[PDB]
Symmetry: C3
Subunit: 494 residues, 3 copies
């Protein structure tokens, strides 16, 4: 069924931040499968325990963007998440109108892997045909962005999108009001904001933005939405300015607004992709597939020169993720002579740009890591940099490389891994079991605070220790106990 596929997707696949489909933002050690929908029903049914704080906090995760900026992905506390996912499942026949929207490019969809939200998933041919087809006969292309979107979505506006603003205000139960309550329970009983990364917040965002899409559609606008980005194709500048006005009205009705540093009108014909994308692909040494693998295999100077050219292009343009695109272009066709050179270049690029650390997972088997302890000092210097810059995805990926490849990790860099206080980093140090006593000091400092929001901020670490019998639950409810009795592990093996 599609209800069952959504129920699997909300918990087994898209609970953790898993929207990016090329490389994940979270290392593959952390997996949310075995958190089955029946365990979510049992958690929702459980009513024990008393909480002194309204709502639940989230395990935080600062992922690095192309400009090294942090984006705070969140792992919802699972007692607050099981109710939210179960509510979205039970109400799916009244929610699936977001699937029938045609202006939302990334939306819930029955993906084969098990997910429902995968950004940048559709193939290049259809994307090109759509871009030309919608750019047919038009003069201007308007790009608009919602300012926060994740930051300031109003949860009380979830019924406003569903049955209208004034009908919902008069009505103040209906399914969308309980959805608003359950979404609020996900993040500290707070009206504004949604945790970034779970598909439940993507569904909540799609529900609110589908009314905006409906009103923009009914006024005859050619437009597409990519999460919070609206692209409009306009025969004249009348359409260009009036779409911006109508989008501003429709967002302001649901308390949202437009990012005016991201608004720009560009005369068609522009570029189907961004300009740096075609600059890289035109100069890519892999741009032609030769149908024989020896020809497809690249040389040392070819890959290195393309990587230098990508570095200059990112310094000179910087409009997008130039390094990640360029590295994905050359990463899978490396010859054995290249692997050490491109590996060290990736070490250089991963230090300077910590979002490039996941690509280091491709080469680690082919590179002989023992060497003369060069890579040993490299990964620790990266770990120190990720501790310094407060970057969670680079820290977690580097620690996944350190435990998976058994490379030792220094004490002084751990002094800042423990002091940074990223939860997912501390779960990796927790799964190592060598640093049991520095982990114990941190969790004891959390418990001695007697602040439930800090325990909810480190719920993944606390649950991993409780499931590994190294600690008891810090909660008086049965949620951790129902998780552990059924075998829920958020750091599972194969």
């Amino acid at each position: 069924d599609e209800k069952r596929h959504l129920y699997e997707a909300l918990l087994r696949h898209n609970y953790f931040p898993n929207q990016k489909g090329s490389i994940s933002e979270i290392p593959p050690c952390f997996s949310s499968r075995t958190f089955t929908p029946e365990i979510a029903e049992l958690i929702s049914s459980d009513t024990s325990g008393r909480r002194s704080l309204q709502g639940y906090d989230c395990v935080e995760y600062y992922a690095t963007r192309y400009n090294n900026f942090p984006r705070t992905l969140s792992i919802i506390h699972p007692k607050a998440y099981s109710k939210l996912a179960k509510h979205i499942h039970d109400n799916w026949e009244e929610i699936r109108f977001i699937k029938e929207n045609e202006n939302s490019m990334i939306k819930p969809d029955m993906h084969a892997d098990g997910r429902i939200i995968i950004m940048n998933y559709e193939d290049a041919e259809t994307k090109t045909i759509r871009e030309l087809n919608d750019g047919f006969g038009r003069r201007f292309k308007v790009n608009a962005d919602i300012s926060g979107c994740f930051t300031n979505i109003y949860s009380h506006s979830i019924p406003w999108a569903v049955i209208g603003v004034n009908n919902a205000k008069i009505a103040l139960k209906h399914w969308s009001d309980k959805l608003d309550y359950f979404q609020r329970q996900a993040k500290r009983n707070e009206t504004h904001g949604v945790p970034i990364g779970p598909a439940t917040s993507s569904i909540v965002c799609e529900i609110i933005l589908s009314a905006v899409d409906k009103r923009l559609r009914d006024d005859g606008f050619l437009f597409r939405r990519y999460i919070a980005a609206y692209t409009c194709y306009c025969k004249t500048h009348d359409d260009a300015k009036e779409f911006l006005h109508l989008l501003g009205m429709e967002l302001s009705k649901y308390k949202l607004s437009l990012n005016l540093h991201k608004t720009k009108i560009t005369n068609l014909p522009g570029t189907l992709n961004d300009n740096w994308v075609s600059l890289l692909n035109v100069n890519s040494p892999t741009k032609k597939r030769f149908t024989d693998q020896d020809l497809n295999k690249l040389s040392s100077s070819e890959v290195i020169n393309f990587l230098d050219y990508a570095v200059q292009l990112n310094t000179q343009v910087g409009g997008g993720s130039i390094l990640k695109y360029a590295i994905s272009l050359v990463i899978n066709n490396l010859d054995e002579y290249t692997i050490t050179q491109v590996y060290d270049y990736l070490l250089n690029l991963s230090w300077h740009y910590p979002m490039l650390i996941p690509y280091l997972g491709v080469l680690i088997e082919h590179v002989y890591l023992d060497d003369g302890d060069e890579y040993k000092n490299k990964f620790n210097e990266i770990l120190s940099m990720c501790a310094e810059n407060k970057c969670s995805d680079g820290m977690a990926w580097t620690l996944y490389f350190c435990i998976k490849n058994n490379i030792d990790i220094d004490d002084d860099v751990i002094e800042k891994i423990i002091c940074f206080g990223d939860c997912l980093s501390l779960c990796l140090l927790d799964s190592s079991d060598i640093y049991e006593e520095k982990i114990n000091n941190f969790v004891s400092d959390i418990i001695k605070l007697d602040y439930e929001y800090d325990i909810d901020r480190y719920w993944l670490l606390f649950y991993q220790r409780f499931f590994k019998d190294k600690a008891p639950s810090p909660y008086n409810d049965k949620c951790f106990d129902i998780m552990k009795g059924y075998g829920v592990d958020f750091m599972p093996d194969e």
Copy 2:
């Protein structure tokens, strides 16, 4: 013979604007062959009829350049053209000194197809060797342009070029005076200007500019002429400024002048082609021929990315016809998977740039045009745009595609095709025979004016209707009758 080849070329091949050798400016439905030299002799011999207006007007044709600018090509009225071509033929032993000029790159020449004027015809190897050989040892490259050339060539200066200015002024018969008269009869008995596109005006321009070439040659200048463009190679800046001075004097003697927005001195070594040409060819995915066709066949992403890069390069440089060069680079090596994608990209580019419409004639058989009437609305939206922008070559090419592929054409776009009043468009609508009555209203409005110049502006439409027996001749002379009796058709089949 060469006299006979010129006589064929003036009427069968280069009567209509046919100078461009890669893609024609006029669709292949309009062909000037079967207008044989014997029919031209019979037209010249005929002396019947009375005309109230001095001279004849021309069928006008606004072709689109690389910057979307119109250039008004002209189809000379054939009673005024037969006399001109016959006069140039009879006097060819006194005209062929323009063929012996060595500084005129495009000039009358015995081409194999049947033409005598083909711009951009010589191969790249000789052009490169000439450019290096003439750039041997020199410091500066001067580029100069005649301002109007076609716009303000003085017809009375045709004998001035032939026998000298003062000798011709004292002489005021010689063959060049009758050539001046016959050239004036081509365009409304007007002294200034030549109809752009016939080879007779190219011969007239070469006759006048050969004296300029002779004087510049005798003063020891290394220079080449491309229609109205002079390139000079200079050992110092003394040569650079003095060539500009002498060219200004020699043009001002024959009443011409220099385009001073097109004058520029560039220090050698510059670029053999223009800079965007090498930028495209260096980045072209077809730049290396592999001697096997599967390797020569291109992929989807390769062609699309090169086309986006060409769009950015034209937006960023714009110095030449970047899109046409880039499309000619990739057009003939398309794989079957590409054809729909590159076709839609060409639809996007043809709408924005109407000179790119002729390339749509390459792909139309390989594209299944029935579809879901998408291409049906595309070609009509292009037709509306060409009606709006007053672009004749895009209109004529799109109509040639519409009749040849049998795709239907809307009434409201025809409301502006009839209102634009391009003659060659109305001959396509005339050959369709569905819109017989809107054509009849236009020609009746022309005839009711009783202005012979408007009848001469639509002589091709009037002759096509008269030859198809749908209308009588609007002329009291026998020229149309001698044309029709011998079977002259300007819209012939095979």
Copy 3:
């Protein structure tokens, strides 16, 4: 042995300016082998003759850089050079500490060909791995240059580097003091400067700069030296400014200084090579080797378009030797159809850029030089340009092409070859033997001056005439006689 290999290298291989390893700065007609170490010992042992001038002058050679700037390479007078080379040989166990330095990239080393100093010699893979390895984890890259280095190295500071500044000042014999004296005797008994091109001056420069390298090393700086260029990799800007301060102190202690027009701090990650290098290599049509030679063979338009793109890139960037790199990329894979076109393009580029003349030695066999005397006028027009611009390497290479290919050379260009007064040019005219009498006038004007420094400036011409029995020695010492008796020829055959 390594002492013997150095002794061979100082005289047989690196006496003449031979540091560049791709194409030499001096044509292959001039070779310093057969000037064996035993002849150097016999010259050093000889004590006859009286000289009225202190020291010896050098045969001068203005080589053209990438910006057409002259660099004055010098061929040391061999009586002053044999003593210097023999002194460096005898003291090699006290000099070889410059070989153990790890921050000097170009230094004495046992090369296979016979040299000890070859700049730009190490392979690209190690250079890339070193550049990434030293750029590991750092924020800034400091580039610094010694201002003159060759121009103002203080010879009295040779013992200052060897045993310390104050110890050497108090000591005022030790081996480094006699090295300072012998280095002074090389150039006119002058304290400042070293003749550029002999390896003895490279050894003298390495001796002085190794103390700077030692002090910079002991203060924990990651830095590399390329002759006179220091590159430093810095974790912060504290290291960046403090390295510049310490390098300025260490150079000022040995009387040197920093080129402050060549000092710049660039945030890593920059470019491993320069930016134009990756721009050329990414756009190079030879960037992928196909393992079959027909595929590796290039077409006409491909090479010509890459050469035009290189010309624009050098006009637009100009940061390095863009033309020489681009030509070396395509020079060895030319197809037979290309050779004439790329040859004429190289003629164009050699005229405008005289450092590109040596590449003309690759193509001269494949090009049929007889033709219609086109290349005959080309090489003479180049010879006139090299005479005009006072460029010695272009003159010498063009004359090597003229004598080797037997192409005639005009009298009026020889009027300026004789008037320029480059010594190596006059040795080529001397070896031709046709122009025996214009050579005789020049050497008689030199001898009538009775200035020993001019005779030392043309010692190579004087020795070549004396060894060819066309003239007697202009020296009262036996050095020329011991050279000729053992068969020393500086223009030898095979």
